[PDB]
Amino acid sequence: SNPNPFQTTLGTDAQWVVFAVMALAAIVFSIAVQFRPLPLRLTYYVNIAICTIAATAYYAMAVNGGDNKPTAGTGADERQVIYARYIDWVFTTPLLLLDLVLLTNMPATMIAWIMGADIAMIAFGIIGAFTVGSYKWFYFVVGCIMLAVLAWGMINPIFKEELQKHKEYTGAYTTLLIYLIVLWVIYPIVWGLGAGGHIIGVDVEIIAMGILDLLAKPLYAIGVLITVEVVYGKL
């Protein structure tokens, strides 16, 4: 049990690769937005911020991970805790939701509890990550309920026309949101297996979330940017 409980060069190498891609995406988006009309630029800026924040977090993880600190647990159950990822997520996951919220007429009150659930979700994650013993799973389960809550909120503009900007946006909004929800659900699975259950090692969790992050940030961003460009170009 508790296999490979410390970051090695394998995990470090993976983080440097994700760093490079996040940094490149930020640079590319930053050059692109210069060429686009003003109404589109906020959407580019949101995604520039997301990728810049992720790049910064991966830089920190790649530079410091080999220190093999901090840890949670003792003896045979001791495991490295990589917490920089949560600092990334508490800023980037609301921005990722904002990408889609901007396509809707969600009232402020609604945006508020969606974003609140999102932030709470990340908070429960990092608290759980440092918690030794069975109580970690209370934080985990409530964090999962928060994911359900924010997902429910994001789903409502699909079928509540009073929450829609244009009914014609519904297809793209729906498709992007389902993509998002599918990816986001994998994160607590990785957490439960790694940070929580010590079933998978640290390098493996690093690699899994590196893949998810690439899918959930720059690739997602490209989908959002294509969507707003196509929409704006037609109305």
Paired residues of 164 in beta bridges: 104
Would you give the binding string for ligand C14 spanning residues 181-220, x where CB under 6 A is met?
----x--xx--xx---x-----------------------
Between 94 and 128, name the residue whose CB sits nearer to ligand CCCCCCCC.
Answer: 94
The listed partner (ligand CCCCCCCCCCCC, ligand RET, ligand C14, none) that binds 211, CB under 5 to 8 Å by sort, is ligand CCCCCCCCCCCC
Q: Are 92 and 217 in contact (CB under 8 A)?
A: yes
Which residues, 6 or more positions from 211, have their beta carbon under 8 angstroms from its beta carbon?
Answer: none
H or E segment and range at residue 71: strand 71-72
By the rule CB under 6 A, 91 interacts with ligand OLB = yes
The listed partner (ligand C14, ligand CCCCCCCC, ligand OLB, none) that binds 197, CB under 5 to 8 Å by sort, is ligand C14
Which residues, 6 or more positions from 134, have their beta carbon under 8 angstroms from its beta carbon?
Answer: none
Q: What string of DSSP letters covers 110-133? A: HHHHHHHHHHHHHHHHHHHHH--S
Between 21 and 177, name the residue whose CB sits nearer to ligand OLB.
Answer: 21
- The Cα–Cα gap between 137 and 149 comes to 18
By the rule CB under 6 A, 66 interacts with ligand OLB = no
Q: Which residue has the tokens 């993880």?
A: 61
Q: Which stretch binds ligand RET (CB under 6 A): 22-30, 34-42, 108-116, 210-218?
A: 210-218
**Contacts to ligand RET by CB under 6 A:** 89, 92-93, 96, 121-122, 124-125, 140, 143-144, 147, 184, 187-188, 191, 213, 216-217
